Design a protein around this ligand. Structure first.
Ligand code: UV1
Length: 119
């Protein structure tokens, strides 16, 4: 029932994500010089360095907010891909499966702790 435990859990999950080779395209904001039209398609850019910095700044109140930003990295990849068989998109799908598998207990434990707090 520790309401703050999610933060270190998210830090450790982001560390695992940065070790994953599949996170390479998503570790830093997309380079507009490499993808000139990216901002015509993507309204809200997101990347794992921005997620980590937001977390470390104390600018996430809950793991749901972090999860929303991580899911935005994956939905941006899907929206920008020219093909469902593209390399970067294919990496995003494996990374998303790994993220979802690991964030599930973080979210469940936080929501349970908060329900206990408000009992
Ligand atoms: C954070 O990096 C993202 C985010 C959304 C979409 C993509 C990428 C990587 C490079 C550009 C790309 O092909 N797709």
């Amino acid at each position: 029932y520790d309401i703050q435990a999610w933060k270190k859990q998210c830090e450790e999950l982001l560390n695992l994500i940065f070790q994953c080779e599949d996170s390479e395209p998503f570790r830093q904001p997309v380079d507009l010089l490499e993808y000139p039209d990216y901002r015509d398609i993507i309204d809200t850019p997101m990347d794992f360095a921005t997620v980590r910095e937001t977390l470390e700044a104390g600018n996430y109140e809950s793991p749901m907010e972090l999860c929303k930003d991580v899911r935005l990295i994956f939905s941006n990849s899907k929206a920008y891909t020219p093909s469902k068989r593209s390399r970067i998109y294919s990496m995003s799908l494996r990374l998303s499966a790994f993220f979802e598998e690991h964030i599930s207990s973080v979210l469940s434990d936080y929501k349970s702790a908060l329900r206990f707090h408000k009992r």
